[PDB]
Design an enzyme around this catalytic site. Structure first.
Site, PDB file in Angstrom:
ATOM      1  N   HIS A  45      -3.119 -27.118  28.874  1.00  9.90           N
ATOM      2  CA  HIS A  45      -2.025 -27.637  28.211  1.00  9.90           C
ATOM      3  C   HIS A  45      -1.145 -26.384  27.637  1.00  9.90           C
ATOM      4  O   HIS A  45       0.157 -26.564  27.475  1.00  9.90           O
ATOM      5  CB  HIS A  45      -2.179 -28.617  27.091  1.00  9.90           C
ATOM      6  N   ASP A  93      -8.979 -30.165  30.340  1.00  4.60           N
ATOM      7  CA  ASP A  93      -7.955 -29.144  29.562  1.00  4.60           C
ATOM      8  C   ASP A  93      -8.340 -27.877  29.695  1.00  4.60           C
ATOM      9  O   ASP A  93      -8.844 -27.110  28.787  1.00  4.60           O
ATOM     10  CB  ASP A  93      -7.601 -29.510  28.223  1.00  4.60           C
ATOM     11  N   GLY A 186      -1.751 -23.510  18.134  1.00  2.00           N
ATOM     12  CA  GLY A 186      -1.456 -21.979  18.339  1.00  2.00           C
ATOM     13  C   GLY A 186      -3.170 -21.513  18.599  1.00  2.00           C
ATOM     14  O   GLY A 186      -3.161 -20.349  19.009  1.00  2.00           O
ATOM     15  N   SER A 188      -4.930 -23.312  20.307  1.00  2.00           N
ATOM     16  CA  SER A 188      -5.273 -24.066  21.796  1.00  2.00           C
ATOM     17  C   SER A 188      -5.582 -23.071  22.909  1.00  2.00           C
ATOM     18  O   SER A 188      -4.990 -21.883  22.774  1.00  2.00           O
ATOM     19  CB  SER A 188      -4.027 -24.791  22.308  1.00  2.00           C
ATOM     20  N   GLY A 189      -6.455 -23.339  23.537  1.00  6.81           N
ATOM     21  CA  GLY A 189      -6.948 -22.199  24.758  1.00  6.81           C
ATOM     22  C   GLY A 189      -7.871 -21.158  24.311  1.00  6.81           C
ATOM     23  O   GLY A 189      -8.512 -20.538  25.371  1.00  6.81           O
TER      24      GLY A 189
END
Ligand SMILES: [Ca+2]
Ligand SMILES: [Xe]
Length: 240
Positions: A45, A93, A186, A188-189
């Site tokens: 995402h 994801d 922020g 995320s990942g």
């Protein structure tokens, strides 16, 4: 990260800042984990927008010279083929970024170690989330890398009605949900680091939180389960 503490400079050397071009500046958008000298693992995402991306390794303070940063362009993006942008609850994801140069390893820059394939953590396994994400729901990015202690919540509990119900899948790891500490936008990942047999491994790629807010009781932060994607990761790197 909501309810975190500032990470020491050398605690999480595989943490990266994924940044995009805004004007003639770069702005942090997401976290990631360095997994080869020229590959980063992040969330699918994070790389849906048709943006120019760079990766910063050895980053601690987003807005100050740490003396340790290496800045590297993203040359190729491989998002999981099953990922669907309109359906984050379906999972998948995860994405891999090939870097334009191979980064130099040191105490601030190291490869993140991944769990063995199929590994599932026992309920309440201790983990840290790390990142520069919002420090409050609808707040602002951290200036310095934050960490928060977030124990896992197993599938049986996480998928129960009080928690995330059908939204969570076995391809995911839930952690936290105490209502005080959490991932937030922020983050995320980025990684979820969990100690197994004396060593940290990156068990999660931060994926989502409640639409009601980041730190919500019985809404633990949800992560893509890295140990579900080992052969995918290896396959991508071996063909690219
Ligand atoms: Ca810096
Ligand atoms: Xe998030």
């Amino acid at each position: 990260v909501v309810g975190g503490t500032e990470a020491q400079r050398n605690s999480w050397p595989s943490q990266i800042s994924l940044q995009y071009r805004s004007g003639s500046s770069w702005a942090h958008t997401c976290g990631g984990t360095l997994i080869r000298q020229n590959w980063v693992m992040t969330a699918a995402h994070c790389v849906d927008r048709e943006l120019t991306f760079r990766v910063v390794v050895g980053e601690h303070n987003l807005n100050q010279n740490d003396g340790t940063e290496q800045y590297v362009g993203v040359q190729k993006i491989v998002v999981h083929p099953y990922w669907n942008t309109d359906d984050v609850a379906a999972g998948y994801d995860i994405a891999l970024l090939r870097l334009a140069q191979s980064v130099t390893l040191n105490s601030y820059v190291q490869l993140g170690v991944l769990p063995r394939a199929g590994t599932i953590l026992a309920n309440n396994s201790p983990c840290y989330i790390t990142g520069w994400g919002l420090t409050r729901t609808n707040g602002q990015l951290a200036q310095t890398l934050q960490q928060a202690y977030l124990p896992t919540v197993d599938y049986a509990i996480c998928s129960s009605s009080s928690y995330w119900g059908s939204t969570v899948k076995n391809s995911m790891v839930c952690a936290g949900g105490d209502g005080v500490r959490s991932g937030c936008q922020g983050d995320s990942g980025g990684p979820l680091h969990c100690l197994v047999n004396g060593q940290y491994a990156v068990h999660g790629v931060t994926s989502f939180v409640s639409r009601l807010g980041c730190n919500v009781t019985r809404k633990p932060t949800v992560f893509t389960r890295v140990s579900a994607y080992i052969s995918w990761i290896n396959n991508v790197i071996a063909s690219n």
